[PDB]
Design an enzyme around this catalytic site. Structure first.
Site, PDB file in Angstrom:
ATOM      1  N   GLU A  65      -7.456  12.187   9.221  1.00  0.00           N
ATOM      2  CA  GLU A  65      -7.014  13.176  10.218  1.00  0.00           C
ATOM      3  C   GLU A  65      -5.683  13.720   9.744  1.00  0.00           C
ATOM      4  OE1 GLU A  65      -3.973  10.784  12.902  1.00  0.00           O
ATOM      5  OE2 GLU A  65      -4.495  12.933  12.950  1.00  0.00           O
ATOM      6  N   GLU A 248       2.637  -8.231 -15.528  1.00  0.00           N
ATOM      7  CA  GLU A 248       3.598  -9.313 -15.409  1.00  0.00           C
ATOM      8  C   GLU A 248       3.676  -9.875 -14.007  1.00  0.00           C
ATOM      9  OE1 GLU A 248       7.287  -8.694 -17.453  1.00  0.00           O
ATOM     10  OE2 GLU A 248       8.190 -10.418 -16.404  1.00  0.00           O
TER      11      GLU A 248
END
Ligand SMILES: Nc1nc2c(ncn2[C@@H]2O[C@H](COP(=O)(O)OP(=O)(O)OP(=O)(O)O)[C@@H](O)[C@H]2O)c(=O)[nH]1
Ligand SMILES: Nc1nc2c(ncn2[C@@H]2O[C@H](COP(=O)(O)OP(=O)(O)O)[C@@H](O)[C@H]2O)c(=O)[nH]1
Ligand SMILES: [Mg+2]
Lengths: 431, 431, 155
Positions: A65, A248
């Site tokens: 919306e 990482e």
């Protein structure tokens, strides 16, 4: 570069996204029209550069919306974003996962992916995606799980990180949020490498207790969240030695793929009315990370075992003072690591202090820290949700709304059993 | 979703429907010629939900006026807002329904129904994103009950993915002692359980008892009864007509309010109770509003909430007041009255605050409840239907319109089954 | 057969046909298949003048159909106060019980005919009379939450 694309889904995702990008600009010295005065870069991981010298966020905002995104289109940062990367439908998922995943969501998914491809195609070495969304809303829950599925096919080797808003009754908009939360977690579990849950209750309490806000609103909650998210992403946007890329994060924080829900803790959270507060030492702010009241998720780490622990300092922090503070934490406190993990803390220091947004509720501080830890205490968060699910699902309350929107009732049980296996995954680690 | 198409069928339907438009028009700042005369930006933000924007800066109700009796056309045009309605949207028949549901559903009303769908189709195709339909009608007459249920069924087949909502007024011998009304109401309830998503039970028994015992009006008129209805209808639609995030549209209201498909009959309540031009209610506080809201005397259905359990509740506070205080009182009422809320639907009470109060009040509270105590309303009608049906009185008036006698036993059986479901969930425990 | 014609004139409220039919031998106490007489039907459809006439020409004020319904049960159910009074004045059994255990008092209480309820009580209606499910007119009042009726019954 090693670019990252942020995708913001649904009201929550969008509003939190707006707050983050506002902070990122202030941190990197970028103006709301994208211009940056002559400075030298690591911010390129998050911003592209146009030929006219404009710095454009590598971001997509999606909602079913248009209300919330229209604010973005007309607001202070109206010229910052690529206009084609603010996508909206006409009719939302009515707090129903099935609607966001199966019916309404399918009307815009190809458009969203073609727009993500346009951003992807401007990258030299795309690391992956940061996805912001609520668990409780229909778009946040359903469209995101549809999107994550599609991204796994189209970008198989890339990493996907989530920032998820876990429901709190004080600000919940629907009775069915426990259902949406479980249905999205089940379908997104295999597609997400690392997920930072933000518990609206935790943030609500930090606002009341630390910031003296009588009745916190989303504006308050989101500015505190954006400050925590900036501390988590700072490593990706600045030079550093800890968590320098998306891979990482999984290496450091996710020992096993399914238990990919780190707890984030942040300190100090001081009210802007206390400008002249006495500055808190490294020792004090490091200690504060082990207090349950400063956590982004309500749970007790003293009832769990730690598998990984990262401390991300920002500001006037001498590394020797950190080591001495960790030293005290290992000796004094009852912080238990699992036997199969090196009983250690990874430390990253970024020497610029945090930035505060003018209009915010936080005081300027000289030093702060964000601790990211993978603890089994976070399973308390799942247990609380699973219990609410179980109460309504035993009597099949609200299920018709879901099966009537293209979903098989069987999907509630498959999701719930996956959640039972997740709770056991934590039991088997931490006992 | 934005637009609602409003339909009003029969005498009651038009009478209460006309009042609805007069009341919400005053709240939105619309004069009887459709021009805007208001001093607030919140009044226009969601005006499209109920009004079409015309040639000039002139707003026109998205309403369809229907009746088999031409006399009601005149009554409605004579009102202050009578000239605001589109003339093409008055669909009227020649001969009335004679308080015979079979005339409305199968013969006279079936001749006119196609004519009505043409006006509905025109209005619906002009909508940007149709949310659904709203019908006002009585269950005791012939047009509103028989033709209204026919209309509902023909609309649901054309627009199956839209929400169908009714404001259905139940009969009471205290207001109209026409003894065929239990037949008309029972036959209507059968249609309503199968074809509406949300129905507001406006019980004339309760409207009469409020006027008589509480407002001390010795001879209640339909004007006195309709004053309570218009205030209730303004209250329950507030969330749809003003910016907000809880229950802001018919579908989100339905997913929060309806846990089981057939249990979609709401018991609305309102506080403070007032009569036409008395202005007695002045010294009314947040705790008093909150306690009055959940009192039997404030319910628009003649049911004691303390004789059942609340499945879901939506509360709407209107005026300038402390959000904190509203959070506190609402929590207090749930703790104090824990035994009247089902334990297997967590956080089943939802609270909205709108800054604009109704006309003639500084503070107001509207209660929309899905309670198992609504079975007392159906049991009352069932008993009167059975008294009559057992002796087969006036059954020829219905069977003479080609109606099968087994349609009576089927309606009775369905209504009895509905009562049994409410009791099933009233006795159900979490365990 | 003038019986069937008398039943239809009585139901239809045709005063003129009723008098003519009786003048030609029509059976005032004729019955349809369910056992309803001209009086049962005039009492149901509110035809006071026909009720009075039948009562002056041999109608059995306490006749019962196949279900034990008397004319007073039907006048009490439908709500015809005047007919109720005429029937009580002609010896109608105020405490007649039909096949469901209902007395006229039960039927007047369920349908909300408060004036008829007062009338029946004034003529001896048994307030302790229980229907097949054990309910009296007073229990119906409590169960339905009808305060107005309860008050009337408490006298
Ligand atoms: N922290 C925070 N929570 C929010 C915000 N907006 C909504 N929420 C929470 O998100 C949940 C509702 O999900 P939403 O994002 O509003 O819904 P959506 O994703 O747009 O989905 P639909 O509207 O059903 O299509 C509730 O738990 C709200 O409290 C926000 O700005 N910040
Ligand atoms: N509250 C209320 N009830 C009404 C009104 N007009 C009629 N009724 C009730 O509606 C029922 C009769 O239905 P009605 O609408 O007049 O018949 P229709 O025109 O064929 O639908 C009875 O129960 C009346 O008491 C009104 O303005 N307000
Ligand atoms: Mg939304």
């Amino acid at each position: 570069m090693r670019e990252c694309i942020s995708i913001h889904v649904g009201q929550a995702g969008v509003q939190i996204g707006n707050a983050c990008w506002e902070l990122y600009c202030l941190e990197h010295g970028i103006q709301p029209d994208g211009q940056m005065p002559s400075d030298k870069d690591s911010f390129n991981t998050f911003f592209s550069e146009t030929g006219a010298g404009k710095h454009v966020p590598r971001a997509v905002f999606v909602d079913l919306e248009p209300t919330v995104i229209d604010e973005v289109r007309t607001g202070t940062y109206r010229q910052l974003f690529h206009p084609e990367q603010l996508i909206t439908g006409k009719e939302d998922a009515a707090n129903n996962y099935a609607r966001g995943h199966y019916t309404i969501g399918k009307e815009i998914i190809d458009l969203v992916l073609d727009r993500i491809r346009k951003l992807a195609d401007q990258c030299t070495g795309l690391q992956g995606f940061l996805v912001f969304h609520s668990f409780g809303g229909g778009t946040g829950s359903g469209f995101t799980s549809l999107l994550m599925e599609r991204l796994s096919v189209d970008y198989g080797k890339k990493s996907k990180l989530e920032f998820s808003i876990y429901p709190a009754p004080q600000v919940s908009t629907a009775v069915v949020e426990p259902y949406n939360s479980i249905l999205t977690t089940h379908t997104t579990l295999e597609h997400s490498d690392c997920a930072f849950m933000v518990d609206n209750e935790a943030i609500y309490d930090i606002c009341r207790r630390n910031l003296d806000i009588e009745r916190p609103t989303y504006t308050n909650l989101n500015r505190l969240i954006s400050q925590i998210v900036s501390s988590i992403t700072a490593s990706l946007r600045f030079d550093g030695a800890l968590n320098v890329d998306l891979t990482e994060f999984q290496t450091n924080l996710v020992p096993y793929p399914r238990i990919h829900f780190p707890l984030a803790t942040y300190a100090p959270v001081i009210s802007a009315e206390k400008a002249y507060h006495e500055q808190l030492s490294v020792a004090e702010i490091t200690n504060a990370c082990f207090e349950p009241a400063n956590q982004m998720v309500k749970c007790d780490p003293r009832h769990g075992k730690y598998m990984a622990c990262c401390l991300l300092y920002r500001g006037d922090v001498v590394p020797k003072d950190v080591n001495a503070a960790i030293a005290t934490i290992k000796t004094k406190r009852s912080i238990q690591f699992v036997d199969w993990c090196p009983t250690g803390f990874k430390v990253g220091i970024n020497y610029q202090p945090p930035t505060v947004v003018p209009g915010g509720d936080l005081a300027k501080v000289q030093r702060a820290v964000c601790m990211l830890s993978n603890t089994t205490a976070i399973a308390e968060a799942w247990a609380r949700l699973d219990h609410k699910f179980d109460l309504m699902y035993a009597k099949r309350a609200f299920v018709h709304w879901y099966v009537g929107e293209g979903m098989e009732e069987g999907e509630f049980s498959e999701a719930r059993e996956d959640m039972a296996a997740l709770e056991k995954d934590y039991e088997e680690v931490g006992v | 979703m934005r637009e609602i198409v409003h339909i009003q069928a029969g005498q009651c339907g038009n009478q209460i429907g006309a009042k609805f438009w007069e009341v919400i028009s005053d709240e939105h700042g619309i004069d009887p010629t459709g021009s805007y005369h208001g001093d607030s930006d919140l009044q226009l933000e969601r005006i499209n939900v109920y009004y079409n924007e015309a040639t000039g800066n002139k707003y026109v109700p998205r309403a369809i006026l229907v009746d088999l009796e031409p006399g009601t056309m005149d009554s409605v045009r004579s009102g202050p807002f009578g000239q605001i309605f589109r003339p093409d949207n008055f669909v009227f028949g020649q001969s009335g329904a004679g308080n015979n549901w079979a005339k409305g559903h199968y013969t006279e009303g079936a001749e006119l129904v196609d004519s009505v769908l043409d006006v509905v189709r025109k209005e619906s195709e002009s909508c940007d994103c149709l949310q659904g339909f709203q019908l006002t009608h009585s269950l005791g007459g012939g047009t509103g009950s028989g033709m209204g249920t026919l209309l509902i069924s023909k609309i649901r087949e054309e627009y199956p993915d839209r929400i169908m909502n009714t404001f259905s007024v139940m009969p009471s011998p205290k207001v109209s002692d026409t003894v065929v009304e239990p037949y008309n109401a029972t036959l209507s309830v059968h249609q309503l359980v199968e074809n509406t998503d949300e129905t507001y039970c406006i019980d004339n028994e309760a409207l009469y008892d409020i006027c008589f015992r509480t407002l001390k009006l010795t001879t209640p008129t339909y004007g006195d009864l309709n004053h309570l209805v218009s205030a209730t209808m303004s209250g329950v639609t507030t969330c749809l007509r003003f910016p907000g995030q809880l229950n802001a549209d018919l579908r989100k209201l339905a997913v929060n309010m309806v846990p089981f498909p057939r249990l979609h009959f709401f018991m609305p309540g309102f506080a403070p109770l007032t009569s036409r031009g008395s202005q007695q209610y002045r010294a009314l506080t947040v705790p008093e509003l909150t306690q009055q809201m959940f009192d039997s005397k404030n319910m628009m259905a003649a049911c004691d909430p303390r004789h059942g359990r609340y499945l879901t509740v939506a509360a709407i506070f209107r005026g300038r007041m402390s959000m904190k205080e509203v959070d506190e009182q609402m929590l207090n009422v749930q703790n104090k009255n824990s035994s009247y809320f089902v334990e297997w639907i967590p956080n089943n009470v939802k609270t909205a605050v709108c800054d604009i109060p109704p006309r003639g009040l500084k503070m107001s509270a509207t209660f929309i409840g899905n309670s198992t105590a609504i079975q007392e309303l159906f049991k009352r009608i069932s008993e009167q239907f059975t008294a009559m049906f057992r002796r087969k009185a006036f059954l020829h008036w219905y069977t003479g319109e080609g109606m099968d006698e087994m349609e009576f036993t089927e309606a009775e059986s369905n209504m009895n089954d509905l009562v049994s479901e409410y009791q099933q969930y009233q006795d159900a425990t979490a365990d | 057969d003038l019986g069937k014609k008398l039943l239809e004139a009585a139901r239809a409220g045709q005063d003129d046909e009723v008098r003519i039919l009786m003048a030609n031998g029509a059976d005032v106490n004729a019955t349809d298949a369910s056992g309803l007489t001209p009086l049962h039907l005039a009492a149901t459809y509110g035809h006071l003048e026909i009720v009075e006439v039948l009562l002056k020409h041999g109608a059995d004020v306490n006749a019962i159909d196949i279900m034990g319904s008397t004319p007073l049960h039907l006048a009490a159910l439908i709500g015809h106060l005047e007919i109720v009074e005429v029937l009580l004045k002609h010896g109608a059994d105020v405490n007649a019980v039909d096949t469901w255990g209902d007395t006229p008092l039960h039927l007047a209480a369920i349908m909300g005919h408060l004036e008829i309820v007062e009338v029946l009580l004034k003529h001896g209606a048994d307030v302790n009379a229980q229907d097949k499910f054990g309910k009296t007119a007073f229990d119906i009042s409590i169960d339905n939450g009808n305060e107005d009726l309860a008050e009337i019954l408490q006298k």
